[PDB]
Amino acid sequence: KTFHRRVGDVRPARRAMGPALHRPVLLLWAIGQAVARAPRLQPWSTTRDAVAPLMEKYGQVEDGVDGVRYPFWALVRDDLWCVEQAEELTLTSRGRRPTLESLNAVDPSAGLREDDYNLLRSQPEAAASAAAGLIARYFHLLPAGLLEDFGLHELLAGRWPDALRPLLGETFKDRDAIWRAYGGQKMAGIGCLADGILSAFSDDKGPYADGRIPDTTWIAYVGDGLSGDQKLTDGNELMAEHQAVGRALRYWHKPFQGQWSFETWAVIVQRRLRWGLGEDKLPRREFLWVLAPVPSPERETWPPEVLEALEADTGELHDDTGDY
DNA sequence: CCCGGCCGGG
DNA sequence: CCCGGCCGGG
């Protein structure tokens, strides 16, 4: 329901050649519009040639013009968009987005939801997170290009990810108690909060212990399969996804009979396979995600030693199940 | 060229 | 089962 949620729920499926940026590109522009006090609903014709150039540069699509058709209809059933004069459009391919002719012929004014147009105009902070969300989840390298073009530069200048929540160091008693505040799931240590940003949870088993790998800057985090050989699925897949592109994630830590707290952003810098003990207490094959903390998601902020280490990493699983 | 059916991921 | 961008063939 919560606009914050729904924008977070916008996860395009993982096609082979990346996921489809069409739907985020639109939402990003549409926030840039509401920030720039543009009109709530706008006609198809005008939106089309306004977004299409962005879609070509920033959604790495060939025909930006065509591109817009899909999200322009689709985003409605993501409960974020709305389209007056729906009935009048003539549809194709069973229920899917209608024909280019009915779009050009009817020139339907489409735009953002009611409450959402109000919320963005009235509260910049909510507008700030949402573009920070997408900016993080889907772009996250921020080539100088889009800052200005999408909106936005004025909105998120300085440190963009400032707008995201939680803040660093925020503290909660339960795993549950985090969930009330940020959603996602109590569950695997690997997951995404309502905002659609990945979060990894480290529950310390012993006092005067934490995950730091000795004689090193980094943190050893264990894949989230609970009792037998772990699999590149769910949480582990998510890690591998982030690892590929060099995207960062929230590292949560509970000291031990201590409260959870959002201790740092971190980036996967190595993926390792190890023997370890299940919850069942028998040996098993498990993932070792090696994390390097960083100040924020903004690459500009990352120290060189981290950058070297991603450069250096092959991206490939290292199987140590041959000697331990 | 832009209907459609076709992919293939949830 | 479901749908959203892909891409064939009219």
Numbering used by the authors: 95 to 418
What text does the study give?
The Type-IV restriction endonuclease (REase)ScoA3McrA (abbreviated as ScoMcrA hereafter) catalyzes multiple double strand cleavages 16–28 nucleotides (nt) away from the phosphorothioate linkage with the core sequence GPSGCC/GPSGCC. The DNA PT-dependent REase ScoMcrA distinguishes PT-DNA from normal DNA which differs only by one oxygen-to-sulfur swap, and presumably encodes a domain to specifically recognize sulfur on PT-DNA. Each ScoMcrA protomer consists of a head domain, an uncharacterized domain, a SRA-like domain, and an HNH domain. The uncharacterized domain binds specifically to PT-DNA whose sulfur atom is in the Rp but not in the Sp configuration, therefore we named it sulfur-binding domain (SBD).
Similar to the FL ScoMcrA protein, ScoMcrA‒SBD-SRA forms a dimer, with the SRA domain mediating dimerization but no association with PT-DNA. Although there are sulfur atoms in both strands of PT-DNA, which contain a palindromic GPSGCC core sequence, only one sulfur atom in PT-DNA is recognized by ScoMcrA-SBD in both structures. In support of these structural observations, both FL ScoMcrA and ScoMcrA-SBD interacted with hemi-PT-DNA, which has only one of the two DNA strands phosphorothioated, as shown in EMSA assays (lane 5 in Fig. 1a and Supplementary Fig. 5). By combining the structures of FL ScoMcrA and SBD-SRA in complex with PT-DNA, we obtained a model of FL ScoMcrA dimer recognition and cleavage of PT-DNA, which agrees well with our cleavage data. Our model suggests two ScoMcrA might not bind to two strands of one DNA at the same time.
